[PDB]
Symmetry: C2
Subunit: 82 residues, 2 copies
Amino acid sequence: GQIFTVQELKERAKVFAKPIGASYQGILDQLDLVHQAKGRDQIAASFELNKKINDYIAEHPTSGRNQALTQLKEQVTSALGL
Amino acid sequence: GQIFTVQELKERAKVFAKPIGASYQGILDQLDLVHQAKGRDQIAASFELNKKINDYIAEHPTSGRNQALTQLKEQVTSALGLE
Ligand SMILES: [Br-]
Ligand SMILES: [Br-]
Ligand SMILES: [Cl-]
Ligand SMILES: [Cl-]
C-alpha cells in the first residue's frame, strides 16, 4: 500500500545498509592489521585506519535504518495530510 | 593499547545501539498497529507513528556503530599526534 509494511521498511533499510556495511568491514580489517603490526608497520597501518574512518564518516553519516525511516515519515505525512 | 580492538569496538557499538534498537522496535510495533487498524483506528495510529518517528530522529541521529567509530577516530588521532 502507500505506507511501508514492517517487512518493506526492513527491506528498504537493508538496501541502504548494504554499502555502509561493506565500508565498515574494511575498517574492521584495517583495525586488525594495526593490532597485528609493530613499529613502522603499525604507524603506517594506523594512518591508513585514520583515512578509512574519515572516508566512512564522510560517505555514510546516516544509517540504512535512518534513511528508510525518513522515507516512512513522508509516506505517513502524506497519508494523513499536511 | 590506547586504541580499541575489533572486539572492543563491536562491544562499544552494541552498548550505544541498545537504546536505539529499543526506540526502533517501538516504531515497528506502531507500524504494525497502523496496518492492523481499520477506519478511524488507522488514523489515530498513524498520528502516533509519526510522533514516534519524529522523536526517534531527534533522539537517535547517529547509529551505535558510528558513535563507536567516532571514539575510535579520536583514539587513533591521539595516538598519531593529529588533531
Ligand atoms: Br550505520
Ligand atoms: Br541506527
Ligand atoms: Cl547501516
Ligand atoms: Cl544503532
